[PDB]
Amino acid sequence: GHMNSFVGLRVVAKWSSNGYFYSGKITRDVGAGKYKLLFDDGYECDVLGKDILLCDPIPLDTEVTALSEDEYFSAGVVKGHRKESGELYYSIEKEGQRKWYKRMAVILSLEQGNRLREQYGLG
Amino acid sequence: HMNSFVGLRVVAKWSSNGYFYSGKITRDVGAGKYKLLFDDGYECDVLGKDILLCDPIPLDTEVTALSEDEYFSAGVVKGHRKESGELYYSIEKEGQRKWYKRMAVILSLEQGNRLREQYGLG
Ligand SMILES: CC(C)(C)NCCCNC(=O)c1cccc(C(F)(F)F)c1
């Protein structure tokens, strides 16, 4: 049947308006460097392969941004990841304190995502 | 006598066929538009009719609760509480209740259309 392809892979992919990379999954390999991306909020749009990071999970010791109520730019460092009942969580350290976050709350600024492009950029 | 909703939390639709997502009004732009900061950091202008001035989402509202690989899971708001300054909703689905963080509780296109009359800023 279907041969494994990039379809169905979980990734973090760049949002053009603000340059941040958000958790999502590739739903279609459209061709010519374009992909259809389903972000974890249910929104789907086209994203270029150069703007997709093949991170599932984001690796240890990565600088990331962790969303929480009324906080949009909280930088932290990945210190672990675990699955709790089919859901990925990240352990994020900030100034010697740790909180566990669901996958979709962990995003990357442009600068944070660029640190991962060489190793993890799709195309 | 004047009301200004800048700084207040809302649930709002930014794309023509989109869901309504948790956010905050950051500016009254004019022409029936407001600048919206969604909880994920995306900021854009939104028509007032697509903004629901709800915080918290009311008891017994039909909602959609996000979780990994769950995009359409409908449920009903049955309670809410703050844990360390963060709102969580108790969501009932098929007679069982689970707690979800605010940003994960969204309204489908139709679920939001249905509150526009009472809570919409149109
Ligand atoms: C930029 C982007 C298209 C992803 N969102 C647009 C603004 C509305 N979405 C949210 O506020 C939201 C809610 C829950 C989860 C997430 C996600 F980060 F996981 F995608 C996002």
Author numbering:
A (entry chain A): 1481 to 1603
B (entry chain B): 1482 to 1603
Publication passage describing the model:
Our structural characterization of 53BP1TT in complex with the related compounds UNC2991 (Kd = 3.9 ± 0.4 μM), UNC3351 (Kd = 6.8 ± 0.4 μM) and UNC3474 (Kd = 1.0 ± 0.3 μM) revealed a similar three-dimensional (3D) arrangement wherein each ligand not only blocked the methyl-lysine binding site but was encapsulated in a cavity generated by two 53BP1TT molecules. This consistent burial of the histone binding surface of 53BP1TT by dimerization was unexpected. Since the homodimerization interface in the crystal structures buries the histone binding surface of 53BP1TT, such a conformation would be autoinhibitory for chromatin binding. Several of the 53BP1TT residues that are close to the small molecule binding site had two different NMR signals. This is consistent with loss of symmetry observed in our crystal structures, allowing interactions by each of the two 53BP1TT protomers with a different “side” of the bound small molecule. Taken together, our data demonstrate that like in the crystal structures, the small molecules are buried at the interface of a 53BP1TT homodimer in solution.
